[PDB]
Design a protein around this ligand. Sequence first.
Ligand SMILES: CCCc1nn(C)c2c(=O)[nH]c(-c3cc(S(N)(=O)=O)sc3OCC)nc12
Ligand SMILES: [Mg+2]
Ligand SMILES: [Zn+2]
Length: 311
Amino acid sequence: EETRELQSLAAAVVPSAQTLKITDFSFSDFELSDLETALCTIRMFTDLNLVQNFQMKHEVLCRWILSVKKNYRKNVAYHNWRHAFNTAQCMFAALKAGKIQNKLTDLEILALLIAALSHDLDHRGVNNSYIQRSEHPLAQLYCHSIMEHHHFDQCLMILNSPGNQILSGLSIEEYKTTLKIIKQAILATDLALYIKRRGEFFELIRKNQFNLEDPHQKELFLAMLMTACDLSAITKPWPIQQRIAELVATEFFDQGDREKKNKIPSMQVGFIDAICLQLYEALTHVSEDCFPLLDGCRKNRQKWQALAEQQ
Ligand SMILES: CCCc1nn(C)c2c(=O)[nH]c(-c3cc(S(N)(=O)=O)sc3OCC)nc12
Ligand SMILES: [Mg+2]
Ligand SMILES: [Zn+2]
């Protein structure tokens, strides 16, 4: 923690969502400094009316954002602060440009944004031996989303740290509801849970039976939305997706957590087909304004496929 970094963040004027470009599905953070990602984050909370509706104190939100950023590991090639930051930006864009904002409640929106930013806290890279070196090396077989539970634990720890309580303004009832949604959302980032609950979601959309007014369906939708934002790097403009794919490959193969290069194109195509396409197609069914995510995904598949055939 840098009181210096906080002082500078808290005293800065937060530029518009327009100037920060956070309403664009094509948004990229390569050009941004950490302070700038912090300012973008404040703007996300502000334009979603969260600061106002939940009486968040400026200095507290600033301190919370810095604490969250500080708890991601920079030595992890992909699952780091920038990835969490980008997931939250996608959530913002889907809520605003994608018009999903009108379909949810303020608490659900509050929970989703916090969850997007916090869902990978303390991530140590896909090739970590966290559980492998614990007193329960078999835990993952009992509780597969055990690491996601740990990410949530980190999130809660920060929300309860002195000077970082951005939810202090909620009533105990609002608070309990928000924490529950935040938990579900973070657990939802366990790709295994996504694969397990996909079918039901695709089925409903398919048979035109999808109804957000149904408490079970709304919860399912929140989980699907979390996945959509968490994988959104796959939807970015070609030059940006190439760079993001480089980071993922690094974490995956060069243990950049704490040959393949020629197989990467086909790998990405397989990933897009097996995991991404269906999800983004389903999302567009719920809200056509989310089409750019689907469009971007398709364009990247075309690009990777061309390379796969080797140019
Ligand atoms: C936790 C990883 C999920 C993920 N997110 N993103 C954005 C990506 C991505 O772009 N690519 C991959 C991915 C998946 C495979 S495979 N064939 O095992 O399903 S290979 C790969 O990245 C290759 C560099 N995986 C991901
Ligand atoms: Mg993760
Ligand atoms: Zn993630």
